[PDB]
Amino acid sequence: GLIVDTRDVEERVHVMRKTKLAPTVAHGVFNPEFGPAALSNKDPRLNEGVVLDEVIFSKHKGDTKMSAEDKALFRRCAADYASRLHSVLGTANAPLSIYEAIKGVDGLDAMEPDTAPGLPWALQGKRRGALIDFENGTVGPEVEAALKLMEKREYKFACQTFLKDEIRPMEKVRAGKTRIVDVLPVEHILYTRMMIGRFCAQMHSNNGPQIGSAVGCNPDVDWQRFGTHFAQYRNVWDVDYSAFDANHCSDAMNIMFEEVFRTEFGFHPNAEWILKTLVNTEHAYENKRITVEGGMPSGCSATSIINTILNNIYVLYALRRHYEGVELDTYTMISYGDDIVVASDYDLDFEALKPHFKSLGQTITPADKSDKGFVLGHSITDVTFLKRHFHMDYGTGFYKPVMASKTLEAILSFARRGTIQEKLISVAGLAVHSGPDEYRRLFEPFQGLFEIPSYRSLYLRWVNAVCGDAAALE
């Protein structure tokens, strides 16, 4: 988005720290071009002389303002998508009773028991459980207060800013491209799902090429569902954005909320508000406290949904801004946050869409970095969604998600002390689709040191998930 002022005031939020990820026995075998993100502005590997802070906030290249016409077009693309959305989700998007907004409902998972409470709960020292009784299902001291200042529309907050302790490609590592996570005051999160937690519930439940959402899916089995649907079309695109979240122009966000969360659909008239509050944000990075217009903060709940909705509107907006009478049925797509896959029998020219996406402030580019030219013909077995490729299972004919071996090795090369054993299991689930040989190889350097799930043990478990009958009938 756009920085309106970089200031230094009073306190200092200590986010400075080390990485807890650590090389495993695997690292000394695969030696991945991957490594932990720079967490200290003086990290020994920072490519010569570059500042951490400098890089981190350099994604806010500004906030694209739109022409009254482009606006009206977006508002039309929203009124159309938001239509076909609720028309399939029903208007069961009413609010949530406090209790539900904590324990979740059929679909929506229960709020996070205890993770970074945000501001001002930290410049005060204490947990979420130390404010809200998570075991119970209701508020607390300052909680119900904030809850009412919000209820009356008085509430205003500040976004805490975290650092992403994660594995990244050695290049981006040295470039100092450590990602940040705006962790908001937990009451804001609570009221958000109280406003649209029911909307999100249905969202998760009906994920698919229909509503164009992937949020709430289980890639391990929904890959068959998805795979087949995208096997009908002529062309398949694997679009790629640059800081998708950070570049959502103020006008886009404000207009999307307005059109997608109307009381006309059963929402509360404070849905539009609580969402509009996400536009102009204040971020506290140590002693620094910055004001950021535009762009959506990656950290708040519903983030993936909001981004998905956006991503869907952008595709309709962009196309109409170049084609003749484009309708939602002209194409088909499905996105998860910013990750996206589009399909259409028409031979659309995404290369001619860079501008129309630019009008929104989104720089689009093809995934497979080859000749960076939006080519055609591409099929389901070229694109990569959620870092998982669509592979035909030569054993059951069903599709299975395969992560590039390299990328997998990276996951196995770094693990915080002692978690190895449980991760090796989790990660093992992801690697079973790389075949039996690559499975063995990816874990080969672990035998006699840990419990490696037999290749059979997992294949069979996956089989009775993609199609429970297919397991018995065979």
Binding site: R168, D240, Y241, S304
Partner: peptide, 15 residues
């Protein structure tokens, strides 16, 4: 390449 890296997240946590 772009800021878009290959080894990070996938979904929030379990469904």
């Amino acid at each position: 390449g772009p800021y878009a890296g290959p080894l990070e997240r996938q979904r929030p946590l379990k469904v």
